[PDB]
Every structure is written in C-alpha cells, then in structure tokens.
C-alpha cells in the first residue's frame, strides 16, 4: 500500500492530453510498412504550395472559373489600378479559401512572408509593365500609382517574365497576427497598377488575363490549433 | 524564425474528437445500441483526415457515457449505480440480437466494463488495416465488373460496436448516451489533397452539392 | 530532349522541365514490399511505350476534360491485353499533353494528375455510373453548368468544384503543369505508382485521373486559326502483372 | 522523463518529441 | 530574515477566481459562454495591474457545482452529471445550441469532467502575440485615433463555453462553473502605483475620483 | 558645466547634477534577434535625434499640472514627425529636459515624471475620452484642481490627486522622475528607453509614454519678485528607427 | 523532487526555489 | 520487468 | 521488488518467505 | 526517506 495523494485534474478527459492507454489488441502484428509517395510531415509543406487565387471575388464569377481571372486590357489611360485586396490571408475571401487560407483557418495565429506569383496568360505578342505594390497599414489603401509607389513594390515586365513573384515581407509590430480580423493585427493592402500599357499588335486580342497564386515562404509558422469555421454539420451524416 | 512544431500532422490530428454518439434504454430487449465504425459521419474529423489521401496511425478511443432519468410513475425511484458494457464485434463475429444475448460473454471479443461516476474509459488500438495504409478515398468499385458499390464503403469493414446496460434496472427507466472519441496517435500521412469545400452530404460517398469557390465582394478594388 | 521509351519518341525538345510526380521516379516492386508470391510479368518494351489517346478540340467555351488512366490505356495494345489477363498490376506513367497554337493565340490550361479522384454524383442518393466516370479513349468532359439532380447517376461535372467537392483553384497540390500558350506547347508529368497496397486490380480501381482544365480561355483575333486540338500521350512505366488466369471483359 | 508501461507500441504517447 | 515570500512568483502564484457563470439543464436548451478577460475580478486584477507588462503560464482550475431546481414531478432520481468545457480560440466555430456540432472539439481543446471528483485542472502556455502580456494600453485600435481606446483593443483571447453532457432528467438542474487562474513562471516589468479608486468597468481604467488616504483630525493626532 | 549635444542642438545644464537614466537602461537600437519587421529600418540619426523644444507653459500659484503624450508631442516637430508619418512602425527613446528657473526669493516644487503606458480614465464611466482630450501635441493638456463632472461624456478625469489614472498621485515616484525644487533646482533630465511589450509599434495609435509635471508645493513669492515663471519642456528622440515605408497620412 | 511528467514546460511547477 | 506480488500467479501473461 | 514505506515494522507485509 | 515538497512543514514527523 504505497501512500499517494491524488491532485486536482484526476478523472479528467482533456481532449488534448497525451497519456498512455492499455491496448485492446495485444500482440497484433501490424501489416508492414510501404514506401508510399508524397509523405507529409508538416502542414506548412502544404501551405508552401502555390494555389490559384480567386482575385475576382465577383458575385457572378465565384461560381465559375472567372474568379481566378484578373482582367487586363490595353487602355488609353496610364496608372489604372488592376486590383487591390487587403493582406488578410485567413479572413478576406480572396485568400481564406486558398490552400494557405484553409490551413490558416485551423489555427489562431500566423506569422511570415507570403509569395504572390502572377502569371500573364495573354498573347505571345503582347508586352507591358505592371506595378505590384504592398502598402503596409496606417495610411488608407493607395488610391493612385503615386501613392502605391512609396511602399514596397516591384515593376513586372511581361516581356521575359511570363511569371513574376512578389514576396511580401513580414512587417508587423508583433511576432504574429490573428488569422481572424483585428485592426490591432492589421497587415496592409496589396495593389496592382499599370506601369505601362498592354501594347498589342494587329489581329491579336488586346484584352488578356492574369492568374494569381499564393504560397508561404520559408519563414512562416502557425499557432494555437482550433477548428475551422468552413465545415458545418446539422445531423449525423449517413 | 519561429518553430512550426504545432503544425506537424501529429499535433494536427492528435486531439480527441467525437466521431459518433448513440443512446440506449434499460427497458425493452432492444435496449442495446450499435454502430458500424466509420469516420465519415462527423464533419470536422472527416475533413481533417480527408486533407490527405492515405493515412496510417494508432487510435486512442475515449468514451463519454452519460445517463439520465426518464419519466416514471413509481412513488420512489432510487436507481443504484449503473454499469455499462461496450463490446467490439469484428466483421464476421456473432452479433448481440438482444440485451441478454450470449455474445455479451465476450470470450474473445474485447470489451470494456465501466461503472458510472469514474474517469471515462480509454482504449488504444493498433493499425488494423489490411493495406499498408488507411485509404481516405477510393476511385473504384467493389465488384470487378465495374459495378455494385462505388467509393470508400467497399473498403470500410472495421466491424461494429455495441453498447448495453449491465444493470437490471427495474423501477425507474434510464436512458444513456455514449459518445465515441477518436484521437489518432503515431500518424503517417501521404499525398495531400484539397481541403473540402462543399458541405458534406453522405457518410458513404463524396456526393456534394456545388457551392461557389469563395465568399464574394463587389469589385476587384473592393477593400 | 527525345524521351524515347520503347518504339516511341516524343520531341518535347523544349529543353525545359518535366514534373516528376511526388519527387519519385517510377520503379519496380521490391521483394521487401511485395505480397503476391507468383512471379510477375514485366513486358517492358511492349508495354512501357507511348500510347496516344484520341485528341479533343479546345473551344472558347470548353470547361475541361478528364481521363481515368488505367481505363484510358485499357484498350490500347499489349498493356490492355496484360491488363485483361492478370489479376494484379502495377505501373507508373509518363503523361505528355501536347497543344500548340500561335503567338497570336492566348489561353492557359492546368494539367493535373489526381491520385484517387473519387468523384461525386448529381443525385446525392446514388453513386455515378461506370460509363459516366470512365471514357476509355473518349475523354469525359467537365461542364459549364451544374448537372441536374434528377439526372440519376451522373457526375457533378461543375468545373469550379472539380467534381470532388473542393475548390478547383487548389488542385495544384497534385503534380501538375500549366500550358500557357504564350510560353508553353506541352506538359510532361512522370507519375509513380501511388496506392496504399503494393498492387491492385487495374479494372476495379483507377488509381489516377488526368485532368486538363482551361483556367484562362482560348482566344484569338479574326483570321487566326480557329481549331486548336489537344493530344494526350501516356506511356506505362515499370509495368508489372501478377496472377495469370483467363481474360476479363 | 517518460517511460512506457504497456507491452504494445500502440499504447505509447503521441510522437510529440 | 529572508524576502522569499515577496517574490513575484509567490505574490501571483495563488489560484484566484476570475469569473463564474451558470447553465441549466435542457430547460432553455441553454449553454454558458465567457469571453476570457482578467478584469472582471477585482483582487487578481489589482495584483496584476501592479505591473505594466507581464508574462506567465497559467494553471486553470474549474470548480463546478450543481443544484436541484424546484420541480413539479414525482421522484426525481438524477444520475451523476458530466460537464463539457470547450475553448473556442478567436475565429473558431461557435456553439449555437446545447447540441451543436461545434461541441465535437475535433481541434478545439475541451475538458469532460464528471461530478464528484477532483476539480479539473490544466495549464496553458504564454499565448500572447507580443513579447509580453500588456496590462495597460495608452492607445487606440484604429490608426485614425478612434474606435476603441484602452486595453480592450489587445484582448482577443477567445471564448469559453460550458454545457451539461447528460440528457435532461425529469427534474431540472442548475450548475455553476467557477474559473480559477494561477500565474505560473511569472515575469513582470515596469511597476506602477496600485489601484486606489474602485474599479468601474472591465474594459477601461474609468474611475470615480476618491481621496488619497483615510482622514485624521490634526497632523499631531496620534 | 554640463553640455549635452545631440545633433544640431545642445542643452547646457547642471552643476555636477544628476541625469535620471530611466529604468537603468540607456536607449539602444533594435537588435536583429528581438526584431520581427523584415524590411531594413531607416535611422535618420542627426536629423531626428535632436532637442525639439515644445511650447512653454506658465506656472501660476494654483496650477494643478500638465501632461504630454510623447509620440503625439513631437508628432509635428520636424523630420521626426515626417518619418513618423511616412512609416508604419517606429521605435525611439527620449531625453526629456524640463527647464524652470526662478530666484532665491521664489519657492515651489514640481514633480517631473515619465509614465509608460499612461492609459487615462474618463469622467463618464460608460465612455472613453476622445482623441483631442487625451492628445495635445505642442499643446500641453492640463490637470484640473477639482473633479470633472459627469455629462461631458468624453473628457479626461483630470483630478490631479488621482493623476487621471485612478491611483494615488503620491505614488507616481515608481516611474522615472525628478523633482524641480526651486529652492535648489533649475531643471530635470530623464533619459527614457523604449518601454513596450513589442519590439516596434505604430507611433500615432499608441503613445508609449506620457510626461507629467505636477506641482506638489505651489509657487509663491513676495510682492516684487517676478510673477511669471515659465516651464519649458524639451524632448529629444534617441536611437529612432522606422520600418515599413509607404504613403504617409494623418 | 527533480522530475517533470509533461512534455510542455508550461505544465511544470512554480519557480519557488 | 518489475513484479509487485510475491506469488508468480500474480504476474502478467507470457506474451514476450 | 519489496520496499517498505512506513517507519514502523508492524506496518510491513507478512513474512511469507 | 525522500521528501517531495519544497517546504519543511510538509514533512512527516521527526521519528
């Protein structure tokens, strides 16, 4: 009869506990292991994969492939915004359903840089230049290319660069940011503008499309596991 | 940088999750409960597992069993403590047809006896698959004629789980609710796949009702 | 290059990449991971060669196409014959999607190889029919509009869900390339054997599903050639067959 | 400082370290 | 004579009730919920606010006590009652009913505890985004110097839900869960004067001015 | 005599006097280990780290006290303010010099304190004070001699004996401070480091510090002695860093 | 006693020495 | 292995 | 393995061997 | 005899 004193927490079923339990199938010879391709060890391995971004979150487009198409056209103006969405990887609809956003919605905190890959799917004869700019918060969303110019930006020529990667850095007051919206963990705005104009020859289409992809960089981590809000249930499925 | 520890598959999946819960009564002879073991009746765990095509792991089973007094007309109900039996019937074994069947002897079938008011019962189980990894999806049929069944229910054959009162309660009727909780340990995953987008419709197949790719805003400049 | 397998040579000669599955090159089954005891058949040159399926037309409205792979080469030559005569089989593939347009054309295709592409139905209380899921060399098509529920036992081919209830924009996790007519004329993906068992039956189980979905549609000005075909050419690799018997159907 | 008390590996704690 | 008992660890590392709430049987189909703050309680709040920045782990102890409520039925033999405490981190799904799917806690941590045993207890790490917990915030939530002013712009620590797991019995039962915090492994910085005026709100320093000290007659009044 | 020379400016003070070095920490630049912001910071140095002299205020026999929020006090003074507006993140220490001089025939005593995270309370208990009430860059906001009444709805409860923070004003000495005793004193110098829980923060939304000058023994003098005794505050950013350049705004 | 049963440091006892 | 009881019948099964 | 936990000899188990 | 608590008051009697 060893003397013992049970402490508070006894007879407690904590979902996230890691105790040992007696096996119900003793001496069960498990079927051997196999070298199956594509072993995953961390969820960041999936979050690092480029996936098409539905920048065209348009009522009519979301239920079609049109959501992923960013329209660009030869315009007579100069310095016309192509698109703009805030830097909410886990909250804004543009990114919350990307692979990155889906993984983020299972966690509460996120931190790191973000790769936005832009692919021009126009004619081989078209040329042009765009300004891809990430403007940190504090000031409103950049309204003109001049305003966007003062922040982190890159000039992308469609000529040689069929694709161009904008690597948004981690500029935050805190080490992490909430996956859920909070103005204290503000992130910034990502805008695109015409640096030049889509110049096209005769007898080839002047209006083209761009595809956007989101992935995480090597310096990205998530925290405080939680359940996703995207999945809902009303009855036991049968 | 920081550490990606909490984003490992082990931490991702190794959290207890209610996979199914059913009820049984002390009265009647059908006062036993039964459940064919599948992981697709619940949405949360199903999505988490379906983020991968093939999985391999041990399991931690925890049972949350709660009883409740049902209406009665007797002048004084003082039901004594209630004990419960949970039996696992592997595919092909004898199946309890009544609360008082011989199968409940569990000569070979493992089973748990638990009295109310104690810590929830817990049981670990090894990797019980025939293949070298669990299959989350199956793009095939059950019959070689490309007919019969199409989907993961040609593979799911993990046996049934039965529940009963051991007590012979007489005066007051008593209804109990057992909640099964899965926690995969020592996990190995392969071939990641897109997270589920459309809400789940059936436990035995991928059948979905199409939904839009994402939530909507007005214009591409909307902010 | 000239990736010449057997009596077959493709001239990608883009001098540009091939997407090698999940980083694994197809290889034969080791004695350490095998169950079947009888000695397998490895036809090699006769089986591991480029069978080119039927070509399809890329239209300004086309939603996409898909093939079940075992049931795409099921009727093609000695691969199909061994497939009929053996109970167990195991192969990787080299998949080459060829589409060529001009500088004055535009468009962009996603070419993905989905292992275990279990597809959903339009009628939620039924599973799709074999004919609906499978098309031999007759590529089955994705749709521009939701399939009707009343259409019992048909595939919910609405492309924005990929017929699997997920976001079509997230298919990139599966090995894939893009054919952007601007800078691409073909896509080459070398897929290894992906399955939970060392071997499986080749008629009951379509371990992979090829999908070609235009994300940016074809367009061209008046005068530019209007008929743009897509030709798929798949070659088995390291094909093995166990359990010889009479033939199937 | 954690040891295993059960004869079957399935009884062990999760692979957290 | 040693100052051992005056260390910050000894000062703060004693359990303290931060909040307690009630939930009933299926009477209303009602569950309980609490947004996690440390400012609803006076004593522990003051102890913590003796410092501007803090950093620590937590020991969470729950004292759950139930009571039979009046009823009009005959012979109410209630079996042992079990409770579920679910933590919903900010952004997760929210239980809308006693029998919502969110209660599955596939990922959200939660405790299942049966009445009559040792109170359930669990520790939680330093779960802040910054390099230290903030006791005060002389700022706003909006860059426009508007919106919210005070410490309630930093507190996004999620909600905590409570329910009976059992099925309604022929007689109603009301339960009271009491949450207790114990700061463990504490690090404090930047001390500040102790709170003098009584607290008025949980989300701000708002006070009604009070005198400096108790009063006496004259400076010579011993 | 002591001469503190930051950039263009130079304050001549002290006769072997004593500078109060904050919480024992001298301001330093952010290290690469404690940092999160990945973009390279701007360090203007001489252009920013210099003595900006705020507005002077008059110490009269009844004055209750004054306060300034630090990020929003130098917000309008020079290139410090310009970098502040053009960058999303900022981090700086200060050298604060409160100057007050009277004669041997004057008397009085001021408490000069630096309160980190000086969250202040409201008069209407169901509301928080307004931006204008808490902030007064180049415009010292005043403590009051009496409790402010309800109904103002967004005023700061400036009762000095509570310091607008609900504490005993006589316990503010825990914060870095000095006393300007006109009997024996001419000025006060406090070297404050960056006080915050995060490595960098936005300088408009969050006033990391609040300078407070509260007369504990009132000014007095016999007839004939000069009746206008001013107090002049001079603050100098030190080791200022800025991250996240973008479109400025206010 | 010189021990710790849990894999996370937050689970350990107070620093009272 | 460690046995707590003085009689061999009290020991666990011989599965290894 | 038999360790005696109590300071008094009367508290020990029987002399079975 | 090993003591588990940091405080001498927690010890058993001095026997």
Swiss-Prot record, chains D, G, I:
PTMs per UniProt: Myristoylation is required during RNA encapsidation and formation of the mature virus particle.
Localization in the cell: Virion
Role description: Lies on the inner surface of the capsid shell. After binding to the host receptor, the capsid undergoes conformational changes. Capsid protein VP4 is released, Capsid protein VP1 N-terminus is externalized, and together, they shape a pore in the host membrane through which the viral genome is translocated into the host cell cytoplasm.
Assembly: Interacts with capsid protein VP1 and capsid protein VP3.
Protein name: Capsid protein VP4
Species of provenance: Coxsackievirus B1 (strain Japan)
Residues of the full protein shown: 28 to 44 of 2182
